Amino acid sequence: IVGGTSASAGDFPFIVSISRNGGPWCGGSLLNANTVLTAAHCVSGYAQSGFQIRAGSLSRTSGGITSSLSSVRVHPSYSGNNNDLAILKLSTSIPSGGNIGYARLAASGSDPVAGSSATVAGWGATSEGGSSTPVNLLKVTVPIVSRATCRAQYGTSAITNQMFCAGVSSGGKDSCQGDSGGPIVDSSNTLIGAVSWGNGCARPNYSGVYASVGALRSFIDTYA
């Protein structure tokens, strides 16, 4: 997260950190006791044994409850930037309670409205290109950017109806490498997306791009 602030205990109770080969990798959202939602690009094409999820901690390295993966399912139309969600099944179920909870999902057919406030969180780099990643969770609030504006930034075909955008025109506030797969919520605390891609991080005139939960809800419901 670039331009963010420290998360407090009990913020984002459904967030999980996802390590790969024992090192930081990405974020995700706990949907229920045995299921995590993340970005497809976090897991597609990689050995599933490399991953571990941690829930219920501000730290990505310690505390909370961990699990390995039993299975991975990417959206059936995932390709590159598009349809960038996956469902992970956990080897060890994770109960809600304390600083662990489950996400509430945007509805099928919904789309975030331009200018509405969203909050994204993760353990990714705090500088575009940063050399070390924080141990403790960060968060930042950014407005939704209309899909038409985002298409003017990236190209018409580059932003699909399964993506939405968020950021500040002058830059400075964004998700970044290592934040992929983690949650972006709306002003009702409903999970509206997962961190997906962008041109650098927090650059003026290049919004962060998020995989849309509303657009991909049928896949999520099928496998959750």
UniProtKB/Swiss-Prot annotation:
Residues 1-224 form the Peptidase S1 domain. Its EC number is 3.4.21.4. Keywords: Disulfide bond, Hydrolase, Protease, Secreted, Serine protease, Signal, Zymogen. It comes from the Eukaryota. Belongs to the peptidase S1 family. The active site is at H41, D84, S180. One of its GO terms (biological process) is proteolysis. It catalyses: Preferential cleavage: Arg-|-Xaa, Lys-|-Xaa. One of its GO terms (molecular function) is serine-type endopeptidase activity. Disulfide bonds join C26-C42, C150-C165, C176-C201. It is an enzyme of class 3 (hydrolase). This is Trypsin. Its main location: secreted. The record marks D174 as: Required for specificity. It is found in: Secreted. One of its GO terms (cellular component) is extracellular region.
